[PDB]
Amino acid sequence: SQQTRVLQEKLRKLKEAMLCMVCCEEEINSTFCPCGHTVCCESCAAQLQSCPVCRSRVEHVQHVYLPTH
Amino acid sequence: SQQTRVLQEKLRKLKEAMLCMVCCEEEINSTFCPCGHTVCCESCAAQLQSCPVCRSRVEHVQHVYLPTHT
Numbered sequence A: 001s002q003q004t005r006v007l008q009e010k011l012r013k014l015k016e017a018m019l020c021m022v023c024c025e026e027e028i029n030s031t032f033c034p035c036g037h038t039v040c041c042e043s044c045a046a047q048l049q050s051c052p053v054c055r056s057r058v059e060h061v062q063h064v065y066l067p068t069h
Numbered sequence B: 001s002q003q004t005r006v007l008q009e010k011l012r013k014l015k016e017a018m019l020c021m022v023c024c025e026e027e028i029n030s031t032f033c034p035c036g037h038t039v040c041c042e043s044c045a046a047q048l049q050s051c052p053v054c055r056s057r058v059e060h061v062q063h064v065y066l067p068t069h070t
C-alpha cells in the first residue's frame, strides 16, 4: 500500500542518520571530545582536527559502543 | 499489507534500541568513559560507579549529541 512506501522511507532515513556524515558509508561509532558531537565513523573522525558540526577543537576521539552496533 | 506490518516492527525495534537500558523511557545521550558503552540517559548514567555492561570503573560521563535524537 502507500503506507508500505511511507514506512520504507522512514526506515531509510533513520538508517541514514546512523551513517557517518562525512563518508556516508560507515556507521557512526566515534565522539569528538569535549564537544560531544557523535557524527562520524572512526576513519573520518581520526582525520579531523576540528568538529565538523560546531568547529570546536577535537582534544581526542572517544569510541562509542551503541546498542545498534 | 503484511509487508507494512513487517516494516512497522523493524522501525519499532530500532527506536526501542535508542532508549536508556535502565529506565527504558528516555533516549540514550551519555557515554561511560573510558569504556565507551553508550547505553543510558543522563539521569541514569549520573549515579553509576561502574559500567552496567562491562563493569569497568566510570571515570566520567561524556554527553553525546547524536543525529537520531528526537
Ligand SMILES: CS(=O)(=O)c1ccc(Br)cc1
Residues within 6 Å of the ligand: A017, A018, A019, A028, A038, A066, A067, A068, A069, B014, B017, B018, B019, B028, B038, B066, B067, B068
Ligand atoms: C544505539 S542508539 O540507538 O542509542 C544510537 C543512537 C544514535 C546513533 Br547515530 C546510532 C545508534
Ligand SMILES: CS(=O)(=O)c1ccc(Br)cc1
Residues within 6 Å of the ligand: A037, A038, A039, A053, B065, B066, B067, B068, B069
Ligand atoms: C540539540 S540539537 O537538536 O541542536 C542537536 C545538535 C547536534 C546533533 Br548531532 C543532534 C542534535
Ligand SMILES: [Zn+2]
Residues within 6 Å of the ligand: A020, A021, A022, A023, A024, A025, A026, A040, A041, A042, A043, A044, A045
Ligand atoms: Zn566516515
Ligand SMILES: [Zn+2]
Residues within 6 Å of the ligand: A032, A035, A036, A037, A051, A052, A053, A054, A055, A056
Ligand atoms: Zn562539536
Ligand SMILES: [Zn+2]
Residues within 6 Å of the ligand: B020, B021, B022, B023, B024, B025, B026, B040, B041, B042, B043, B044, B045
Ligand atoms: Zn534512563
Ligand SMILES: [Zn+2]
Residues within 6 Å of the ligand: B032, B035, B036, B037, B051, B052, B053, B054, B055, B056
Ligand atoms: Zn562499559
